[PDB]
Every structure is written in C-alpha cells, then in structure tokens.
Amino acid sequence: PQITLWKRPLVTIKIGGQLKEALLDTGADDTVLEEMNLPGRWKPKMIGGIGGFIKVRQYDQILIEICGHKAIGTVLVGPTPVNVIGRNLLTQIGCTLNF
Amino acid sequence: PQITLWKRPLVTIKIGGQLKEALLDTGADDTVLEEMNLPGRWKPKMIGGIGGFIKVRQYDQILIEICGHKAIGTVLVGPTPVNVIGRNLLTQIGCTLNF
Numbered sequence: 465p466q467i468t469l470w471k472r473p474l475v476t477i478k479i480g481g482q483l484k485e486a487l488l489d490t491g492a493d494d495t496v497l498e499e500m501n502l503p504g505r506w507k508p509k510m511i512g513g514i515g516g517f518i519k520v521r522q523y524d525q526i527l528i529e530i531c532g533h534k535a536i537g538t539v540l541v542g543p544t545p546v547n548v549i550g551r552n553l554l555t556q557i558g559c560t561l562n563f
Numbered sequence: 564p565q566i567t568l569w570k571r572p573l574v575t576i577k578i579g580g581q582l583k584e585a586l587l588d589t590g591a592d593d594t595v596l597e598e599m600n601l602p603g604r605w606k607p608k609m610i611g612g613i614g615g616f617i618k619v620r621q622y623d624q625i626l627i628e629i630c631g632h633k634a635i636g637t638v639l640v641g642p643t644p645v646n647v648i649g650r651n652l653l654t655q656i657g658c659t660l661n662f
C-alpha cells in the first residue's frame with residue numbers, strides 16, 4: 465500500500481504471539497519496542513536519540529509480521545515511549561520513500 | 564525519487580542559503596536541525612524524543628529545499644543528534660511510504 469504522512473504512520477504488528485501498534489520509522493536504524501517479556505537470550509544495549517540514551521535488551525532473529533508482511537531480525541526491547549519499526553525490518557517488507 | 568532503506572535516507576537540503584545533509588525521518592512529527600545560525604525571530608520550544616525532552620529554537624515559515632523540492636514550514640534548531648526532516652515537511656514535498 466501507500467501511506468501518506470499527514471498523520472503518524474502507525475500500523476499493527478504481530479510479535480511474540482501478541483499484537484501491537486508501531487510506527488514505520490525511516491529515521492530508526494533498528495526496531496525498538498515497548499517492554500515485553502520475550503523468551504530467549506538477549507544482550508544489553510544503549511540507544512540514543514533526542515533527549516539522550518535509554519537502556520534496552522537486544523533480541524536477535526525475532527519474527528515480526530507488519531501489515532501481513534513477514535520479517536525476521538533484531539528487536540530492541542525497553543522503556544521506549546513509542547514503538548518504532550526501523551530500517552532493519554522495513555527493508556525486509558520492501559518499504560521505500562517516494563516523492 | 565524512490566529511496567530504499569538499506570542505508571540511512573540522507574539527502575542534501577538548502578536552508579538559509581547553506582547546504583546541509585539531513586535524514587528523512589517518518590518517525591519525527593517535526594523537523595529538527597543541529598545548532599546553526601538562521602535569520603529571523605524565534606520562540607523557545609520544548610520537544611521530546613526517545614530519551615527525554617530538549618530545548619529548541621522554533622523558526623516558523625522557513626524556506627527549505629529538500630532533495631530538489633521546496634518547502635516552507637517550521638524548523639526546530641537545537642541539540643538533536645542528527646539533522647532530521649520530519650512529517651511537517653515530508654508532506655509538503657509529497658513524500659509517502661510504499662511497500
């Protein structure tokens with residue numbers, strides 16, 4: 465589909481057997497999601513943006529479905545104020561910017 | 564153009580007569596540039612990111628050309644980690660997400 469940017473580009477995703485809402489975010493290298501107790505091993509990480517850094521847990525090879533499009537890659541989990549789908553997963557669903 | 568997302572979507576912009584590099588950021592509501600000299604009045608503003616809030620200088624109705632496409636809109640100037648073009652100007656240049 466085509467998503468205009470008059471409003472935030474929010475979509476439903478499926479991850480860890482749960483449904484959530486997340487932003488399709490071309491400004492995020494990697495995907496960052498709200499606290500969720502995912503199974504498996506993880507590695508600590510710190511990620512920065514406007515305002516400074518937060519602590520997150522890096523999970524690898526996680527399956528996410530985004531508007532019916534399946535993808536598999538790194539998900540960072542922590543106290544983010546917003547769920548963002550980053551380029552690591554947007555590339556996998558064939559997402560481009562167009563103007 | 565059609566821009567894929569395997570790399571950061573960085574483009575050249577022109578503002579205040581100066582060229583700069585900026586990131587097309589669908590996750591940003593607003594356009595935030597690193598510290599720079601811009602002519603005209605400005606009002607102090609606060610904006611929040613992943614790590615908290617920062618103070619910016621808000622410049623309204625600023626001419627800015629993004630990858631060959633003109634916009635005139637609000638530009639926030641302050642300690643952002645990187646120059647970002649947000650949705651307030653992405654809509655002006657007709658930018659959509661497509662997959």
Ligand SMILES: CCOP(=O)(COc1ccc(C[C@H](NC(=O)O[C@H]2CO[C@H]3OCC[C@H]32)[C@H](O)CN(CC(CC)CC)S(=O)(=O)c2ccc(CO)cc2)cc1)OCC
Binds near residue numbers: 496593
């Ligand atoms: C419930 C209330 O939430 P809130 O207001 C904040 O909500 C938010 C809404 C959207 C975002 C997404 C963020 N956009 C953003 O910063 O936009 C600013 C300007 O425009 C305003 O609109 C939205 C906020 C304001 C950007 O797209 C992505 N970022 C990187 C860019 C930073 C500019 C480039 C380095 S990153 O997220 O930092 C990030 C860093 C590392 C990694 C791992 O690779 C992944 C993601 C973040 C928080 O609370 C405040 C305390």
